[PDB]
C-alpha cells in the first residue's frame, strides 16, 4: 500500500510538510519496535511513502520557479536542457541557417529546377 | 595500531561486516549454484594489505 502520489498533488505545501514530519515520526517507532520482534516488513511501506511525499513536494517548488522564470532567458542551469554537452554547445538552427545575401540572392534566383527526362 | 586514521578503521569495519558464512536460505533459492562463501577471510590466513 502506502501513499498515493496523485492524492498528494492536490494538497498544498503546508499540508505536505505536516505529512512528511508525520511520516518521519511513524517510521521512528517502527524502528523502535523492530529491534524486539523478529521481522517487520511494514517499515518498507513507510520508507517508500516518505520518498513519494518528498518527490511530490519537490516538483511543486520546481515548477514554482519555472513559472517564476517563465518567458525570459537565463533559466537556472539545473532547469535547462540536459541534451548533451556537445549538443548543448551546438549551434542553433537559426544560427546555422544564417546566409549571406550573396548566396541569399542566388538561392532566390537560381534553385535546383525539378526536371524529368522522358521527351 | 591503536592510533589510526578514519580511513583505516572505516575499511576495517567493511571487512568485519563481510566476515561470516553464507546465509542459509540462499541455497534454497530456485536455480541456485552458490554453495558457500568463497571470499571469506580470516586474520590468520591472508592479510588485507590496507
Amino acid at each position: 500500500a502506502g501513499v498515493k502520489a496523485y492524492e498528494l498533488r492536490t494538497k498544498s505545501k503546508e499540508q505536505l510538510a505536516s505529512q512528511l514530519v508525520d511520516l518521519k515520526k511513524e517510521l521512528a517507532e517502527l524502528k523502535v519496535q523492530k529491534l524486539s520482534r523478529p521481522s517487520l516488513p511494514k517499515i518498507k511501506t513507510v520508507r517508500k511513502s516518505i520518498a513519494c511525499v518528498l518527490t511530490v513536494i519537490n516538483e511543486q517548488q520546481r515548477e514554482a520557479v519555472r513559472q517564476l522564470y517563465k518567458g525570459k532567458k537565463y533559466q537556472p542551469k539545473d532547469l535547462r536542457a540536459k541534451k548533451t554537452r556537445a549538443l548543448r554547445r551546438a549551434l542553433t538552427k537559426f544560427e546555422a541557417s544564417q546566409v549571406t545575401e550573396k548566396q541569399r540572392k542566388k538561392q532566390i534566383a537560381f534553385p535546383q529546377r525539378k526536371y524529368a527526362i522522358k521527351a | 595500531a591503536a592510533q589510526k586514521s578514519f580511513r583505516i578503521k572505516q575499511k576495517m569495519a567493511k571487512a568485519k561486516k563481510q566476515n561470516r558464512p553464507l546465509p542459509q536460505w540462499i541455497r534454497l533459492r530456485t536455480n541456485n549454484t552458490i554453495r558457500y562463501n568463497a571470499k571469506r577471510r580470516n586474520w590468520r590466513r591472508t592479510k588485507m594489505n590496507i
Partner: protein, 145 residues
C-alpha cells in the same frame, strides 16, 4: 637460400604485413548497400535521373587520344553557344566545366548538338505549376550514348 633452377622473386613481406591485409569479405554486402542508396537517392530527387549530362571528350596521352570518352563538364563556351546560362544549366542536370576550354570544332559542335538534343528531350517544370508526373529514367548517359 638460393637453389635449383628457378626465377628470382621479389616478395615484399618483411614488414609486419599481417595487420594491413584486406580481404573484402563484403563484396556482396557492399553491393546491396550500393543498390539501396542508389535507389534511396532516386526517390528523394524523384523525377531527375541521378546524374548530370556529361560531355563527349577526346582523351589525352597519345596512347588513348584515339578513343573518345565522357568528360567532366560543358566548357562554358558550350553552354553559352547553346544559349543557356551556367547558373541555370547547373539546375538542369548539365555538368559545366569552368576550367576546360574548347579547341576543336568537330569536338566543339558535338557538345553543342549533344546539349541541344538534351534540351529537346527534357521537361523542366514550373516552380509553382502542377508539375505532372513524367516517368523518370535513371540515366542521361544511357539516354544519350
Amino acid at each position: 637460400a638460393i637453389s635449383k633452377n628457378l626465377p628470382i622473386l621479389k616478395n615484399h613481406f618483411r614488414k609486419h604485413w599481417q595487420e594491413r591485409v584486406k580481404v573484402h569479405f563484403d563484396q556482396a554486402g557492399k553491393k546491396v548497400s550500393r543498390r539501396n542508396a542508389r535507389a534511396t537517392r532516386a526517390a528523394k530527387i524523384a523525377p531527375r535521373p541521378l546524374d548530370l549530362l556529361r560531355p563527349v571528350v577526346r582523351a589525352p596521352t597519345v596512347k588513348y587520344n584515339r578513343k573518345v570518352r565522357a568528360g567532366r563538364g560543358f566548357t562554358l563556351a558550350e553552354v553559352k553557344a547553346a544559349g543557356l546560362t551556367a547558373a541555370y544549366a547547373r539546375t538542369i542536370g548539365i555538368a559545366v566545366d569552368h576550367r576546360r576550354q574548347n579547341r576543336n570544332q568537330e569536338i566543339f559542335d558535338a557538345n553543342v548538338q549533344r546539349l541541344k538534343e538534351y534540351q529537346s528531350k527534357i521537361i523542366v517544370f514550373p516552380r509553382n505549376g502542377k508539375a505532372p508526373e513524367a516517368e523518370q529514367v535513371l540515366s542521361a548517359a544511357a539516354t544519350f550514348p
